[PDB]
Design a protein around this ligand. Structure first.
Ligand SMILES: NC(=O)C1=CN([C@@H]2O[C@H](COP(=O)(O)OP(=O)(O)OC[C@H]3O[C@@H](n4cnc5c(N)ncnc54)[C@H](O)[C@@H]3O)[C@@H](O)[C@H]2O)C=CC1
Length: 200
């Protein structure tokens, strides 16, 4: 389907424009327009803001529909590594480290069912039956590491935050499967955040 093809492109390269665009961050505007022209969402090479915005919507919607069309799986937890201790993210860090808080992730959300990629923040994300996440499998561009992707606007409850340097943290970390790639170092981990996707 054209929608699965759009999701393949998202995976390969489109995520680099679309997630910033959906978060409201500065994004590469010329690159977005070229992608829309290239994939025929735009015919004018000088779209109005309206035409551009509408075209981006169809393109994002195509990616989400392709995602939605993939088979569901029985996964009940997934993992995501984030770098949250950058100064420019101090607000985002506050949101994610407020116990009980409810966060709406505006971009597509990339997670792994298999392992957490080590970063200052490890997200331990519990899922309830019927959630919108989908295993990409061979739709993914680079394969051989599993990926469960979620469409825009996933709602996450912050259940508990576990800072480094305690037995609790040590135990919880030991129960995660962590990436053991060329630069893996668990001593870089500042926190675990236990979260839950709120469906519906
Ligand atoms: N992060 C992960 O654990 C997973 C990533 N991957 C792969 O990694 C590659 C990159 O994906 P991601 O790292 O997921 O990129 P992303 O665009 O989803 O992550 C954004 C990064 O931007 C920053 N950021 C700014 N605003 C944010 C916000 N409001 N919420 C969360 N983070 C915010 C954070 O520092 C974060 O580390 C992709 O090719 C994907 O296939 C695969 C599985 C899991």
């Amino acid at each position: 389907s054209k929608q699965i093809q759009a999701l393949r492109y998202y995976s390969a390269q489109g995520y680099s424009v679309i997630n910033k665009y959906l978060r409201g961050d500065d994004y590469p505007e010329t690159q977005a327009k070229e992608t829309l022209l290239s994939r025929d969402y735009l015919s004018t090479n000088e779209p109005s803001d309206e035409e551009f915005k509408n075209a981006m919507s169809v393109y994002i919607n195509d990616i989400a529909e392709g995602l939605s069309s993939l088979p569901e799986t029985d996964h009940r937890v997934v993992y995501r590594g984030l770098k949250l201790d950058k100064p420019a993210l101090s607000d985002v860090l506050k949101e994610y480290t407020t116990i009980g808080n409810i966060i709406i992730d505006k971009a597509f959300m990339s997670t792994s069912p298999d392992k957490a990629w080590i970063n200052d923040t490890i997200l331990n994300i519990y899922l309830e039956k019927g959630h919108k996440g989908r295993i990409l499998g061979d739709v993914a561009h680079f394969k051989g590491e599993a990926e469960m992707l979620f469409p825009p606007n996933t709602k996450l409850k912050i259940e508990s935050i576990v800072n480094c340097g305690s037995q609790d943290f040590a135990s919880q970390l030991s129960k995660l499967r962590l990436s053991d790639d060329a630069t893996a170092d668990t001593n870089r981990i500042k926190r675990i955040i236990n979260m839950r996707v709120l469906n519906s």
